[PDB]
Amino acid sequence: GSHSMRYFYTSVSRPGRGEPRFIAVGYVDDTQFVRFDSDAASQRMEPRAPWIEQEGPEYWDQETRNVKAQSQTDRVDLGTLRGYYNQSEDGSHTIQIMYGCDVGPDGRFLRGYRQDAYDGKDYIALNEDLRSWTAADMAAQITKRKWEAAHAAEQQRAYLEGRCVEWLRRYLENGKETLQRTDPPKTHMTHHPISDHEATLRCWALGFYPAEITLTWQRDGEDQTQDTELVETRPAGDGTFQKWAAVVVPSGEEQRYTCHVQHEGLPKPLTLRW
């Protein structure tokens, strides 16, 4: 269908514990593919998906160059930010950037993204136009005005609009069997008596790709929200996801309840019954 490439960078200062920690991860859809750790012995962008291993040392070099350059930038910026928000040296802080791009089935552009946050709170973000910035505060305003004068936006768009989609095209061809797959859920159902007058009814969706799934409970066609428990979609650790939904029902009336599973890997929505 439609695809997305996303990078997530995390810089964490460690006062008196040496230099700050930079971690960067890259995903296509729900599949991670690259990593880089300031700490880890390597000091290279490492592959974390098979389709990426085919990439030359020329690829790995530039990727490492890029990432270290940001890491050093963040190093400086961590200090500039304490100066801004008048903070002590002893305290540890976090800089995070999340950037990417979406493409339609065509294989062409949809949107771009670049957003920053300092200590988990929104800092600055590039607008949908990829021409303007939004400053979250008085501090972020100095960064905005700086980036405005540097013409950062133009450069951002150039990547976001071009280079970004171009890599995506490539990663999707080169990694079709992994990335262009649709893994429908393994759907079962469990009953757990909590009384002789009550019982929890569980519905399991396991080993599915992508992570986007919808789990809905129904009592004879009528949608249920009255005493439904839904868990946060979690990963298998093998590159598929897990989600379950539960409901409290009166003993015996177990046959009255139905669960509907909506997933991209399903030709038509599934329905389970006890």
């Binding site: 990078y7 980036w147 950062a152």
Partner: peptide, 10 residues
């Protein structure tokens, strides 16, 4: 692929 320059200081 990651973004190279800009990398403008905040």
């Amino acid at each position: 692929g990651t973004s190279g320059s800009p990398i403008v200081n905040r």
